[PDB]
Amino acid sequence: SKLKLSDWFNPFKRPEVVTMTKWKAPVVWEGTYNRAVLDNYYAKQKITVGLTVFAVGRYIEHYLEEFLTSANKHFMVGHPVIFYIMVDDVSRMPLIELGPLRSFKVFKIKPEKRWQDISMMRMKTIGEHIVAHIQHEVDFLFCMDVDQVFQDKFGVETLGESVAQLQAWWYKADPNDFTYERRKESAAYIPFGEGDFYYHAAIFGGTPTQVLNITQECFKGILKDKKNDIEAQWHEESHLNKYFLLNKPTKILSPEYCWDYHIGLPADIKLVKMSWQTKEYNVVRNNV
Amino acid sequence: SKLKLSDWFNPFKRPEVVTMTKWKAPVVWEGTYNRAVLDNYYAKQKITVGLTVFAVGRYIEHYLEEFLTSANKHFMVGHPVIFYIMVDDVSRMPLIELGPLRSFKVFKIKPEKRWQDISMMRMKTIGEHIVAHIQHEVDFLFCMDVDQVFQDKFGVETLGESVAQLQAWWYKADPNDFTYERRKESAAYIPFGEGDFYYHAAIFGGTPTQVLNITQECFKGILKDKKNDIEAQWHEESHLNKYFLLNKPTKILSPEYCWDYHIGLPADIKLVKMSWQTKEYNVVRNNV
Numbered sequence: 208s209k210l211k212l213s214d215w216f217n218p219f220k221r222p223e224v225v226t227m228t229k230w231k232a233p234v235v236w237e238g239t240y241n242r243a244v245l246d247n248y249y250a251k252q253k254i255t256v257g258l259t260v261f262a263v264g265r266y267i268e269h270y271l272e273e274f275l276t277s278a279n280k281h282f283m284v285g286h287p288v289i290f291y292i293m294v295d296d297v298s299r300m301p302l303i304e305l306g307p308l309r310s311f312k313v314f315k316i317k318p319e320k321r322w323q324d325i326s327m328m329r330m331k332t333i334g335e336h337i338v339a340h341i342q343h344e345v346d347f348l349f350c351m352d353v354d355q356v357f358q359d360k361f362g363v364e365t366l367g368e369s370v371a372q373l374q375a376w377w378y379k380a381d382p383n384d385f386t387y388e389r390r391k392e393s394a395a396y397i398p399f400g401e402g403d404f405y406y407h408a409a410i411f412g413g414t415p416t417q418v419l420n421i422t423q424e425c426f427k428g429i430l431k432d433k434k435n436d437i438e439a440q441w442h443e444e445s446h447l448n449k450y451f452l453l454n455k456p457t458k459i460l461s462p463e464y465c466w467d468y469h470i471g472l473p474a475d476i477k478l479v480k481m482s483w484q485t486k487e488y489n490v491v492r493n494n495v
Numbered sequence: 496s497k498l499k500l501s502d503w504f505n506p507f508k509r510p511e512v513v514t515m516t517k518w519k520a521p522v523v524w525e526g527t528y529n530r531a532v533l534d535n536y537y538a539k540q541k542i543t544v545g546l547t548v549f550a551v552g553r554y555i556e557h558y559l560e561e562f563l564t565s566a567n568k569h570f571m572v573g574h575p576v577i578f579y580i581m582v583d584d585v586s587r588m589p590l591i592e593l594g595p596l597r598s599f600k601v602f603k604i605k606p607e608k609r610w611q612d613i614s615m616m617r618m619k620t621i622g623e624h625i626v627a628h629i630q631h632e633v634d635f636l637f638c639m640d641v642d643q644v645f646q647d648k649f650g651v652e653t654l655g656e657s658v659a660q661l662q663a664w665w666y667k668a669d670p671n672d673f674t675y676e677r678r679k680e681s682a683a684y685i686p687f688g689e690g691d692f693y694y695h696a697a698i699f700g701g702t703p704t705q706v707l708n709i710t711q712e713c714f715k716g717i718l719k720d721k722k723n724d725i726e727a728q729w730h731e732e733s734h735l736n737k738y739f740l741l742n743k744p745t746k747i748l749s750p751e752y753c754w755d756y757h758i759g760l761p762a763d764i765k766l767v768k769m770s771w772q773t774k775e776y777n778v779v780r781n782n783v
């Protein structure tokens with residue numbers, strides 16, 4: 208029969224951290240997952256996993272290659288994977304060598320004038336690509352920032368209907384300290400006294416159906432704000448958090464899946480699967 | 496289960512041409528296949544189809560783009576396809592936009608000094624790639640020349656264990672007129688009095704297992720001839736023909752699947768799926 212949470216998830220292996228949400232969704236931490244059981248189950252379902260990534264402007268030279276090279280080596284090893292790359296200058300797209308079960312597909316996109324819109328417009332573009340082709344090509348999809356690098360296996364244990372990432376700096380913080388959009392005028396507004404976690408927009412996924420809804424609702428909020436002459440504090444991330452507050456994710460990833468070494472390396476982070484690239488806004492951004 | 500030939504192949508539709516061999520293999524002509532029945536069959540088995548193509552030197556600028564643009568449009572439509580592109584200079588590789596169910600993988604290869612060796616080395620390289628990864632990615636694979644363009648649907652009706660292509664200029668000729676290698680000193684030698692058809696090396700395919708044997712055996716003959724100071728009249732094509740004589744293909748494609756318009760367009764050619772590019776050796780080749 209079907210896959211059951213206990214088949215692959217054992218929360219008691221990590222008693223010192225949050226492994227379950229009040230809506231019964233698991234928070235995946237190193238040690239709680241049985242990847243062997245899942246690689247088997249999914250192999251028999253012959254699944255294919257997609258991964259979208261954008262690189263506009265200097266983000267191409269600065270991060271695209273490192274991102275893809277690491278993704279090839281660590282993302283969903285043992286299963287067919289398709290990398291969907293969106294850049295503004297395809298002549299700069301690095302055609303590095305891919306390994307077994309990896310393939311790519313590159314798309315030329317318009318570069319928005321403000322880096323903020325470059326970051327936010329991703330929600331619209333992803334939705335279009337899901338409708339146009341991704342829904343027909345994969346069973347699950349992850350959408351990620353390019354300014355990060357895979358450090359270890361990021362596999363099937365991360366798959367789910369809708370998947371969210373716990374932002375590294377706030378996983379232990381109280382919701383009322385979260386950097387949610389606090390202005391009622393914004394569609395991303397979340398009042399004090401509300402919120403479960405602070406999700407990182409650098410990583411999110413799920414089935415194409417769920418990701419389409421996530422990206423569609425987020426872009427609708429982004430456009431609504433533009434009509435009301437307001438822009439969320441943390442752009443599409445603020446909208447993503449509003450979305451995940453209303454539509455609880457079926458799976459959350461621990462900070463081990465998107466860690467910022469600037470924090471150092473505390474006891475809770477047992478095995479880092481991905482790490483943030485140091486910020487270099489002075490050079491990679493050309494406005495604000 | 497159990498796909499039977501009559502399920503999709505009806506020879507009586509083309510009574511004026513050879514539609515069946517003496518060893519039970521069908522010769523696919525326009526009108527004889529039921530692609531609808533096959534598409535449904537293969538869709539249920541969730542097959543993926545691979546296509547390899549080499550472009551070394553000026554063949555890249557002259558033919559790679561056109562080849563890929565046409566393949567994207569007509570090759571195995573409705574099914575997952577992976578294009579494996581082998582070039583010697585990835586920077587000149589045209590990265591065209593691909594449509595639904597199409598994805599790429601590019602590899603940098605060494606350019607052999609003689610065009611004859613570039614053409615023949617393909618047999619070795621394909622074999623290496625099948626073992627390293629293609630055998631784990633596709634159910635069927637086609638290996639094609641780059642100096643041609645898809646003109647119409649080239650689909651599932653072409654799939655089989657081992658697939659051979661009839662050369663457009665000799666499909667009606669007698670075996671003794673075929674341009675086989677007639678020197679007994681060559682591993683590709685075929686005596687007068689023998690032979691079924693003259694196969695084109697511009698197109699051949701089958702399951703990864705079969706293509707691995709086709710390629711490995713041809714290359715062995717190629718290396719042997721080098722040890723005996725002889726080079727087949729039509730290079731790897733001569734060896735391919737010797738191979739298909741000993742190991743009969745389970746399916747053959749009519750000239751409609753690889754036609755040369757310089758012959759003109761006779762009544763037998765009902766619907767062209769692929770056409771030869773005009774030869775331009777003076778520019779694309781650097782040695783006699």
Ligand SMILES: CC(=O)N[C@@H]1[C@@H](O)[C@H](O[C@@H]2O[C@H](CO)[C@H](O)[C@H](O)[C@H]2O)[C@@H](CO)O[C@H]1O
Binds near residue numbers: 386407408441444486
């Ligand atoms: C505690 C604290 O203030 N920590 C900040 C981090 O939050 C910050 O990361 C940024 O966080 C915002 C959300 O608040 C968003 O996720 C950004 O994309 C992310 O980069 C970090 C940045 O260097 O500095 C810490 O001091």
Ligand SMILES: CC(=O)N[C@@H]1[C@@H](O)[C@H](O[C@@H]2O[C@H](CO)[C@H](O)[C@H](O)[C@H]2O)[C@@H](CO)O[C@H]1O
Binds near residue numbers: 774
């Ligand atoms: C009748 C005749 O000689 N026709 C030739 C074609 O055969 C020839 O095509 C070449 O054929 C050889 C095998 O004989 C091999 O397949 C080559 O790759 C192929 O290009 C054609 C070439 O322009 O000229 C005709 O006159």
Ligand SMILES: O=c1ccn([C@@H]2O[C@H](COP(=O)(O)OP(=O)(O)O)[C@@H](O)[C@H]2O)c(=O)[nH]1
Binds near residue numbers: 266323353492
């Ligand atoms: O000028 C830009 C701005 C953004 N991005 C994309 O948008 C993501 C989010 O922006 P950024 O990473 O800079 O935000 P941060 O995490 O730093 O907050 C990046 O990873 C890129 O993929 C880009 O390519 N070029």
Ligand SMILES: O=c1ccn([C@@H]2O[C@H](COP(=O)(O)OP(=O)(O)O)[C@@H](O)[C@H]2O)c(=O)[nH]1
Binds near residue numbers: 551611641774
């Ligand atoms: O210098 C060369 C010679 C050959 N090829 C490859 O080998 C195939 C066979 O060579 P060619 O087409 O020129 O042979 P022909 O059909 O003309 O006889 C080509 O389509 C290319 O894919 C190449 O890329 N560069």
Ligand SMILES: [Mn+2]
Binds near residue numbers: 354409
């Ligand atoms: Mn980022």
Ligand SMILES: [Mn+2]
Binds near residue numbers: 642
């Ligand atoms: Mn050719």
